[PDB]
Design a protein around this ligand. Structure first.
Ligand code: 8NJ
Length: 109
């Protein structure tokens, strides 16, 4: 069922926003501030930005047909982070930690 799928998707995102994962999930909470220092080239490299607050709104506006569509946006958020940042950056390690949480939950549904 697509409706049951989307309720599980809202549940997965709720855990990603939870205090349990807050120490490594916080840079993905809100859109990347492109006006901040060191982020002047962010829009040149990242054509499709995504964050957890935009995903939360997209679920609430019913912009996802199914779990795969929600999954594609979550992975876009992680891929943007791996594409923009150097492999040794602190935020890359945090993206991997949060992706481990998402992937385990997304697979077991
Ligand atoms: C997804 N994301 C997010 C942030 C970010 C956005 C707001 C505040 C901190 C951010 O990052 C941290 C910088 C230092 C320590 C931990 C994280 C960023 C910065 C450069 N690249 C990114 C990025 O790709």
């Amino acid at each position: 069922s697509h409706m049951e799928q989307l309720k599980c998707c809202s549940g997965i995102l709720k855990e990603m926003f939870a205090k349990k994962h807050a120490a490594y999930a916080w840079p993905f909470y809100k859109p990347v501030d492109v006006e901040a220092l060191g982020l002047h080239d962010y829009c040149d490299i990242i054509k499709h930005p995504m964050d957890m607050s935009t995903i939360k709104s997209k679920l609430e506006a019913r912009e996802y047909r199914d779990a795969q569509e929600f999954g594609a946006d979550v992975r876009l958020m992680f891929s943007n982070c791996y594409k923009y940042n150097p492999p040794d950056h602190e935020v890359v390690a945090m993206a991997r930690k949060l992706q481990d949480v998402f992937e385990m939950r997304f697979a077991k549904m």
